[PDB]
Design a protein around this nucleic acid. Structure first.
Ligand SMILES: [Zn+2]
Ligand SMILES: [Zn+2]
Lengths: 659, 647
RNA sequence: GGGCAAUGUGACUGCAUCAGCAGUCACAUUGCCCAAG
RNA sequence: CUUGGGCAAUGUGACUGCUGAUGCAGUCACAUUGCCC
């Protein structure tokens, strides 16, 4: 037999000893004062231990206030533990939901007032003691996202919170004239939590029909930061969004060492509700494009005048390996597919950007991290032209590095494609493909300088070079969770450097003039490197392949130069300038790349907790300066290796120092 | 002010009226006469059209009986329509729960300031279409015939495998009516409607929108993780996710459903597997007296191990590196909803839902390791005979070994991923056999011609898929097709001398061949989208070998008897090995549901299906059309490289 | 293994100083056509 | 032109209530001492 119990509009701690087979129905008269009042309820079970033998559902609270409802099927179950208390929210009433009026405070024609029905239950034949804990967030906090005229960012401060006391919000855009929205949730204390947004129509606790695919509800873990972004199209699709911030007891999905106060520790939180407006970065891009075209002055005094001094093809067109495109194009196709055919919230849930200052442009959330890759595809289409513009004669100078330079061009372009397709959704997918084209190019430069004084280098070496780089990258990715991955990299690195030493020795005859020093140099440098990335927790798994590859490239090129100067040939002054500039550009590219600070060895929240702010214009971060100066360094190294052996074009192909 | 209302067991259709700002709770005292009675409590809104102006929700019915509670926020809306009636189920009480009695609260609120009328049906299901999955001793199959399933009466099920001592379970639903439906199952302790934090990240509940068929496979690592399962089969209102149009969408119609509960036990198919390997080593009777005899009669490496293109592997070992990562990290219940096999012949093994479409992809990696050796061990005369095609036939080797990797993972489970990669490799093999027989009389054909052929196929394979959903894709496979075959015609006359007795009688074929194929697939919707690029290819190969098989004898050269019989079987294989491929019928255009309705029963031994055999016979034709082009000109072995014709 | 009293923490309800927010009643201005004198 | 009434919003203060911050006291939980039959 039910026992209705009127509740007071003022009391928030309702301790009632529920009898056996009795079903309380509390009741709270809602009036003009509860419009847009987030009503959060919270149950409990007193002396929880006494029921530790009975399993499943014990108590059942079913709050409801006419516009929404939910159930609390105590005691909740979790991947770790069972809790005997938990709170949920309610879609608050609105001004419409108990009628519009003029004056007189419900004059007397109608007498309308909603009501909040709190039900209780028990599956036990025995008696239970609960503690309902109804509270309220008034209109001052829910539906706080109304903006005044000439305002863009409203901000809370230290909004307290607790496992049994979450916070919501109500972003309505159509009724607010909003284009783009970007939330931000600071915090200080490492206590796991959950941000959750849902369009207004739609409800959180209710499961969907084939949900995991039909799911417009993002759910973001976070400890010290989380960010949202309501794109223009999502706004025009749903028109009104409910933000929530739940919070969890433990740190399972967040970390390993767990907080002590189980489901009891309050955690601070702030917010930032920005109201952006669409903007195309024409000024920030300006300084870039001009800065990526000042070094092109290195063609006017040299090459554009040589082409003026001159003013099978089917066979090479068919023998040039163009299945070297397929890795990067396949990965960019897969990535674009998985991006476009994803829900509008699975993007913000899955793409771990640097939402610190990842500047957006329409649908894309990090424009700078993308369009700064145009340095490459600008310094990529150059090489593919210079070579095919000055390919000749065949009796003086060294052999022609025509097709190898065309391949360095095709890969300087594929680098931009891979980078701008991985900086759309930087998730931990099986294949990284940000650096691997940089690695392939820093291999091709080595092969060019290895073969330039023997024969025309064939591009078919890019086949094994690419297979090596791609297999190594997939390997690093797939073994990232264990501990011996840096040992795998150490041993493969050793095998490669040893094979290179051997190929060196079996090409000349073990001359003490060159090999005795060269082998030693390589082995000591690369063993220093193996140490530096096998004992130090500052080389992540992403960067070790790139560092070893660019170090091999730099070392072999400096050795080429050292042997050219020891044999007493001339290195033109422009070549020395180009070499020094390539060295310092690679140095800058390093100093910037080293702060990638991205390792999928940690959980989601630990990766959203990182926020490295940008440096220039509020548009250039650190990874983007890497993207630029990598292209600069590639261009400078390429121009170097295309200039140092120019002064020998007046020497026969017989008296050339072979090495 | 609340209003209690007791209702005994005699009222099923409770009709009441709801005043302004009022709240009705009800109660139907339950006793031991209600245990294991799966109940459903639905609500409506009388005079529905009167409320068509109010936006949002009207009633909030919250049934609850202690053990199982849920909600009803009428009118539940759907992307096509708003239903003013909905019903849900209840986990019945357990015998342990039994002076003493359990009850059934039904709160009914109302946000509307005006009055509301409503009804309240209550229904029951037990003793059948529930608790029916109890197996007798030594019983592995239980069956139900023409079970009614109306929208007002969803069917329930309870599988308690722990007590039933089950290891692997299978569930099938044959039907006949073209009515949408839904099939959801959950772990015992879980509910159906209740979400939680990262619930989607633990969404162990499956949903198989099924028109005519649906299948449920309960693995060993599911049973051993939840130990008890709940099954339901609803009737979805609209045909959006399960069909195309609002054709007869307005209805609440009955539906007949069957079942077949098969309690499989894990095993290995030593009978049919071995009956295949011996089938793929008998047509190897050709290598008996010839290839291993020349070696006995016969009894740079540092550079060509570099100048060989090994970057042609990556288009596959990158793709399969993803179809795996997507198979492992996919939740244990997501695999039954994302992977659309052909469960009429998809015999399982260990974990995989299909081991008849994977272990028959060993006819390739077996016929692959032969071409890799019988070409390397068949070159040792370097001024006699045709040029040694012993580097190319390493690729045709590899691309017969790759094909047994891109395919035997596309048959792990075939999502509608961007790249199909079941045929692509076979397409290229039938390509190389052209480049080989082309350059066979001019120069040792460098394998680097794949670099331009691969990017050809993969692009034409990605181009197909991206525009698979649109209506004008088949016209794109006309312009891309015509362009290349036009060149391959033009590329001939610019090499031979435009001899009309040869060229004008060779362009006449590809003009008549490819065109006759275009209209065959451009006007007729029998060649599905994926199968056209392949049949385009294998024809270019066969024609270019009917030609090379003629231009040899047309120039009055003799062919050896072994090549006579070899090639004559290749035509027999490529003819039958098409007929089986001709029944794939996997068009990712149609809806998810109908893509499950396909069911082609096993052909032989209950382990060989139609699309299965295209994986075997695609290896015979892949072999006979290789031995052919390496034995066709053996008679010319005693003729100098100058006294030979050229074409 | 048990309870009591303290030590320190972590929650919790209601008093006291400040914040945004809702409602209540009264104030003041404004123009307004139709109606008439 | 003035009054009577109606509209509407601006902003005016008056009162009530909510939510978050610093202290104030007091209830509940966890670990160390002392005691006990
Ligand atoms: Zn990048
Ligand atoms: Zn297949």
């Amino acid at each position: 037999s039910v026992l209705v119990f009127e509740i007071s509009s003022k009391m928030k701690m309702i301790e009632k000893k529920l009898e056996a087979n009795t079903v309380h129905v509390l009741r709270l008269e809602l009036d003009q004062s509860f419009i847009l009042d987030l009503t959060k309820v919270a149950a409990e079970i007193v002396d929880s231990s006494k029921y530790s033998k009975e399993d499943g559902v014990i108590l059942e609270v079913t709050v409801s206030n006419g516009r929404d409802s939910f159930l609390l099927k105590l005691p909740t179950v979790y991947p770790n533990l069972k809790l005997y208390t938990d709170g949920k929210l309610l879609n608050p009433l609105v001004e419409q939901d108990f009628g519009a009026h003029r004056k007189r405070h419900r004059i007397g024609d109608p007498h309308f007032h909603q009501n909040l029905i709190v039900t209780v239950q028990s599956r036990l034949n025995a008696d239970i003691d609960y503690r309902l804990h109804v509270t309220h967030l008034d209109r001052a906090q829910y539906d706080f996202l109304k903006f005044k005229t000439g305002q863009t960012t409203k901000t809370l401060s230290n909004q307290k919170l607790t496992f049994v006391k979450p916070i919501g919000f109500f972003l309505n855009c159509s009724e607010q004239n909003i284009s783009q929205f970007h939330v931000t949730l600071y915090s200080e204390d490492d206590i796991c939590a959950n941000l959750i947004t849902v369009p207004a129509n739609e409800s959180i606790y209710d499961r969907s029909v084939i949900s995991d695919k039909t799911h417009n509800r993002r759910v973001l873990s976070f400890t010290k930061r989380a960010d949202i972004f309501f794109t223009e199209t999502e706004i025009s699709m749903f028109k009104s969004f409910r933000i929530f911030v739940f919070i969890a007891p433990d740190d399972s999905g967040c970390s390993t060492n767990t907080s002590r106060k189980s489901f009891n520790e309050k955690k601070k939180i702030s917010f930032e509700f920005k109201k952006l407006e669409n903007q195309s970065y024409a000024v920030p891009t300006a300084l870039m494009m001009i800065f990526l075209t000042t070094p092109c002055l290195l063609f006017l005094p040299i090459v554009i005048n040589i082409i003026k001094n001159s003013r099978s093809l089917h066979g090479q067109m068919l023998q040039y390996p163009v299945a070297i495109i397929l890795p990067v194009l396949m990965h960019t196709a897969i990535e674009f597919h998985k991006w476009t055919t994803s829900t509008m919230a699975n993007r913000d849930e899955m793409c771990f950007h640097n939402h610190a200052c990842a500047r957006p442009l329409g649908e894309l959330r990090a424009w700078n991290n993308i369009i700064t890759n145009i340095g490459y595809t600008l310094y990529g289409a150059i090489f593919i032209v210079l070579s095919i513009c000055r390919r000749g004669s065949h009796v003086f100078g060294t052999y022609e590095c025509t097709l190898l330079d065309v391949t360095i061009g095709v890969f300087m372009v594929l680098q931009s494609i891979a980078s701008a397709t991985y900086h759309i959704c930087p998730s931990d997918v099986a294949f990284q493909f940000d650096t691997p084209c940089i690695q392939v190019i820093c291999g091709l430069l080595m092969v060019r300088q290895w073969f330039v004084r023997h024969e025309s280098p064939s591009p078919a070496y890019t086949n094994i070079l690419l297979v090596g780089v791609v297999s190594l990258n997939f390997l690093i990715s797939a073994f990232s969770k264990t501990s011996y991955v840096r040992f795998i990299i150490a041993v493969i690195h050793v095998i490669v450097v040893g094979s290179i030493c051997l190929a060196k020795e079996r090409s000349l005859g073990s001359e003490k003039l060159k090999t005795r020093f060269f082998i030693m140099a390589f082995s000591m440098g690369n063993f220093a490197a193996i140490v530096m990335y096998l004992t130090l927790s500052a080389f992540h798994l992403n960067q070790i392949a790139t560092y070893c590859f660019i170090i091999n490239c730099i070392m072999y090129l400096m050795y080429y130069g050292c042997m050219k100067v020891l044999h007493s040939e001339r290195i033109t002054s422009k070549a020395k300038l180009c070499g020094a500039l390539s060295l310092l550009a690679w140095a800058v590219a390093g100093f910037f790349f080293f702060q990638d600070d991205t390792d999928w060895t940690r959980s989601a929240a630990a990766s959203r907790a990182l926020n490295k702010p940008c440096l220039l214009l509020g548009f250039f971060g650190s990874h983007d300066l890497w993207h630029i100066f990598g292209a600069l360094a590639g261009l400078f190294t390429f121009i170097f290796v295309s200039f140092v052996d120019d002064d020998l074009i007046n020497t026969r192909k017989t008296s050339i120092n072979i090495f």
